[PDB]
Amino acid sequence: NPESADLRALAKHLYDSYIKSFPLTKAKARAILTGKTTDKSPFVIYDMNSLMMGEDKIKFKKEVAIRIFQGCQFHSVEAVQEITEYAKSIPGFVNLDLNDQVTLLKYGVHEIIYTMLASLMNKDGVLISEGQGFMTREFLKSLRKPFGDFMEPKFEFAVKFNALELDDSDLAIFIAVIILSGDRPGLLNVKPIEDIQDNLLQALELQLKLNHPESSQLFAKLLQKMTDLRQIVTEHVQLLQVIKKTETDMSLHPLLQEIYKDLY
């Protein structure tokens, strides 16, 4: 029916836009993690020595905890660029008040980074540098405090999240639903945001009934996690507060300073 059809068109536009925006998809990521891909396997980083030997297969651009954390920074910065491009493809997003565009991204990007990082993660580790590395969870836990506790909440969220076995086509809409959140602090004009999100939420619902018809309210569980995501971010911001105070021989990439300044 035509109401359903408009919401299919939206699901397809978003999916296409997601594939162009984001180099490594959950499809490819999963392949790499299960060895299904016939492509060269990722260099495994499990200790100080493997990390040193790994520098050839990844891009670093003094101590190991600081250098890992700086690598995370670089991943985030590139993710923020990709997410910003994907946001601009969300019908109606660019017609919003530019100050609102900036507020939605400012509060949205980390929730989306952690959603999309779950695609790169299993209980044992995370793909890095577009899946040409694999950094073990144990190694990231092993780091000296406060860096030791930095990635563990993201793994904890990822193992739960990956159970829903969403694919790209699903994640494309879910990610847009997160960006268009009408309740972010300091929004000037909530109504056109809620109007777009209402449409995205209908597309997400239709999408979760068609692409997983053996599932049932996959839709309802997914909306609950949108609150799990905000706590990862709240918790993550506090840890950045700690890290920025306790350490002095590292600054934050300027893009991440903009985002984190006057955030929770």
């Binding site: 660029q81 910003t84 530019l98 565009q101 900036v102 991204l105 400012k106 893009l255 903009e258 985002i259």
Partner: peptide, 11 residues
């Protein structure tokens, strides 16, 4: 304020 985000959004 949010100079880089503005730049990425206006690019």
């Amino acid at each position: 304020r949010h100079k880089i985000l503005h730049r990425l959004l206006q690019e």
